[PDB]
């Protein structure tokens, strides 16, 4: 009612010569917010021998206060490719590992799994056994050394493997006929596939997972979790910054 | 008889609005399945001195459960170029080798062979002798160091050398007039040629063979070996995966 | 024939935001196509074309009773890190950044029964003084009049007023780009009702949409919860 200002008048609000543009919104571009490296996870290695476990690239669980945590929670359905950096930190005296040969293998959404030592390198007694799937072949293997290695890390790009045209970050259903608990918001292969780190370290070190999700596609906006306690009435939420009264 | 559905009718099956395409089959492209690195073999070195043995690049024997094992067994006749990676692992305390100079030489399908020390490097007493054919020349030599060498490996491409327009991965015949055992599925130079690794390590290390076969050409499909035990009646074959009830 | 190269000083350093990508190790993957509706492109769109519901003492509405006068009914420090925003979309989206910019639209939906009527002065008070405390005090400023019983819902635009080309998504001890003012709804009259024994009060929901000129910048990582 009445609209454009100055007259006390009922529905009549005042004028607003709305703003110009700068930045063209671009930072809030879902594809851009997601194409960078995130420190998601931290895990330890496996000994070259034993009958070890594969690890799963599932950045959909969350709960850890991390920005990329939420954001993936912001949408119902997601699709993007993957990109890694694995860094391996030291947890003892760095002079313990002279070699430090690390085997890594990537497993695509839905690959077979049981592995036991099965490859045997020998030479001058002693002789090493690497893992049955640590080996090089079909799924990409990546071997790197950490011995003065100016950056104890390795890295690469890996495609959207799932058999699902998109991934439901939420699922009002079960992924199995047996409607068991655990099988709730599940639906199998709703992730990026898996990896196996294995080495004569394993002890002496932890890892550093890092994902970069290029080509981000987000479908169906969802409620965006608060992330901070509710401040008191009629007040602000004061925080420490690059600004502030010095 | 009758064909397109709904009428109880004899030969009459129901309808099938067959599928769309995605992936264009491309993964099953023999040329693509083969152009990557495979951990085929594992061997030890030879001392710079003695009267050593050449090694043969024959990835046609098989028996080892390895995917690339079968696949080469999938065809009667094969042709592709070769590509290597040799990595040298350590089998003792990595601080034993200060130098670690390794001589490698590649020998094309049908090269001469007897080698004894024959090259003498001298300087300040002691003096090293390398192998008569370890030397650099006609067949490619590759020398690399493993002393902090951030990747104790070396690598290169080598052409289809054989005098056979193609290689019979199977041979109902003998390769010699003397129809002896051993000379059965043989026919000489039905492989890629050979290599010689030699170094002041030899002890202190094993190797890591890896082939990549570009330009794969496969002629005459053959039966493809099962690879898993026969499961029980009317059941599936349950296996561990990236999916599965968690 | 080998190229002549010098190894730039940082050479083996990592850096987590490289404008470039890593090396592929699993090519030739063609993916299945997706019809799946509502793929959003940019976060500002849902924030603009979408109303969130405010936060006052725990509920998303404010009350009018058959007794009120000039006591301000709704008040908020115009800052994203303000209270009555805490629950909302816009506010929470902005946590993902450093600087905000523009006007915000407020939607008040009076929800008292039809037998009922009332009026309010929604006003915006510029960040100088020490905050007004009565209608007759705020009235001299930017405000309009809402007679519930003409529209049962009304929109009000909290403008962008600042030497600040951009503003602070993360406010704190009062700075010059920390606050843009104060939103206040006052009670112009009180609750008239057919029968005051049934309808004695009214609940005006208050929602927040993002401003058309609204924008966000400089993505940031999360500090310690607080």
């Amino acid at each position: 009612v009445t609209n454009v200002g100055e007259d006390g008048e009922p529905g009549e609000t005042e004028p607003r010569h709305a703003l110009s543009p700068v930045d063209m919104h671009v930072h809030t571009d879902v594809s851009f917010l997601l194409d960078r490296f995130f420190d998601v996870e931290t895990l330890e290695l496996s000994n070259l021998t034993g009958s070890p476990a594969t690890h799963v690239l599932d950045p959909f669980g969350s709960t850890a206060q991390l920005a990329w945590a939420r954001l993936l929670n912001t949408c119902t359905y997601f699709f993007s490719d993957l990109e890694l950096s694995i860094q391996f930190k030291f947890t003892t005296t760095p002079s313990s590992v002279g070699e430090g040969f690390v085997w890594v293998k990537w497993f695509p959404v839905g690959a077979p799994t049981k592995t036991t030592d099965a490859w045997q390198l020998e030479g001058g007694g002693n002789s090493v056994r690497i893992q049955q799937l640590a080996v090089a072949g079909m799924s990409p293997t990546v071997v790197f050394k950490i011995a003065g290695s100016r950056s104890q890390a390795c890295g690469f790009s890996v495609p959207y493997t799932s058999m699902w045209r998109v991934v439901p970050v939420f699922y009002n259903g079960w992924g199995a006929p047996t409607k068991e608990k655990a099988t709730y918001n599940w639906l199998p292969g709703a992730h990026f596939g898996s990896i196996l780190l294995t080495s004569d370290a394993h002890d002496k070190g932890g890892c550093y997972l890092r994902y970069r999700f290029p080509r981000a596609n987000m479908y169906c906006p969802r409620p965006i979790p608060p992330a901070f306690t509710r401040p008191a009435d009629k007040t602000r939420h004061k925080f420490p910054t690059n600004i502030n009264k010095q | 008889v009758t064909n397109v559905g709904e009428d109880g009718e004899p030969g009459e099956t129901e309808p099938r609005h067959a599928l769309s395409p995605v992936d264009m089959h491309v993964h099953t492209d023999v040329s693509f399945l083969l152009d990557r690195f495979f951990d085929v073999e594992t061997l030890e070195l030879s001392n710079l001195t003695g009267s050593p043995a050449t090694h043969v690049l024959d990835p046609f024997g098989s028996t080892a459960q390895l995917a690339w094992a079968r696949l080469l067994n999938t065809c009667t006749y094969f042709f592709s170029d070769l590509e290597l990676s040799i990595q040298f692992k350590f089998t003792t305390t990595p601080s034993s080798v200060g130098e670690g100079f390794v001589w490698v030489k590649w020998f094309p399908v049908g090269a001469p062979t007897k080698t004894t020390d024959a090259w003498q490097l001298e300087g300040g007493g002691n003096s090293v002798r390398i192998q008569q054919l370890a030397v650099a020349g006609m067949s490619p030599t590759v020398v690399f160091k493993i002393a902090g060498s951030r990747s104790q490996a070396c690598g290169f491409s080598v052409p289809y050398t054989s005098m056979w327009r193609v290689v019979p991965v199977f041979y109902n015949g003998w390769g010699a007039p003397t129809k002896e055992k051993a000379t059965y599925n043989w026919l000489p130079g039905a492989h890629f040629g050979s290599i010689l690794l030699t170094s002041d390590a030899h002890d202190k290390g094993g190797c890591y063979l890896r082939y990549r076969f570009p330009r794969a050409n496969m002629y005459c499909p053959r039966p493809i070996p099962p690879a898993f035990t026969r499961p029980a009646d009317k059941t599936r074959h349950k296996f561990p995966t990236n999916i599965n009830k968690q | 024939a080998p190229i002549r190269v010098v190894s730039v000083p940082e050479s083996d350093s990592f850096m987590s935001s490289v404008p470039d990508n890593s090396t592929p190790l699993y090519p030739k993957v063609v993916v299945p196509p997706r019809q799946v509706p509502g793929r959003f492109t940019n976060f500002i769109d849902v924030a603009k074309q979408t109303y969130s519901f405010c936060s006052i003492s725990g509920k998303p509405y404010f009350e009018v009773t058959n007794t009120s006068g000039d006591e301000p009914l709704f008040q908020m420090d115009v800052s994203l890190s303000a209270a009555e925003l805490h629950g909302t979309y816009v506010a929470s989206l902005s946590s993902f950044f450093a600087q905000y910019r523009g006007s915000l639209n407020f939607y008040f939906i009076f929800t008292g029964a039809a037998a009922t009527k009332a009026k309010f002065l929604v006003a915006f008070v510029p960040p100088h003084s020490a905050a007004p405390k009565t209608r007759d005090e705020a009235m001299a400023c930017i405000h309009a009049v809402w007679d519930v019983g003409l529209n049962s819902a009304f929109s009000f635009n909290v403008p962008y007023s600042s030497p600040a080309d951009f503003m602070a998504v993360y406010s704190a001890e009062a700075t010059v780009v920390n606050v843009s003012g104060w939103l206040q709804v006052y009670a112009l009259t009180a609750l008239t009702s057919t029968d005051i024994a049934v309808n004695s009060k009214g609940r005006v929901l208050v929602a927040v949409s993002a401003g058309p000129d609204f924008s966000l910048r400089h993505p940031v990582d999360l500090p310690d919860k607080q």
Partner: peptide, 21 residues
């Protein structure tokens, strides 16, 4: 979105990433 170099296409559009229909 965020890929900005020139060498970003050092590898093919086909090899590098994934491809829709």
């Amino acid at each position: 979105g965020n890929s900005g170099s020139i060498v970003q296409n050092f590898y093919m559009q086909q090899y590098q990433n994934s491809i829709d229909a």
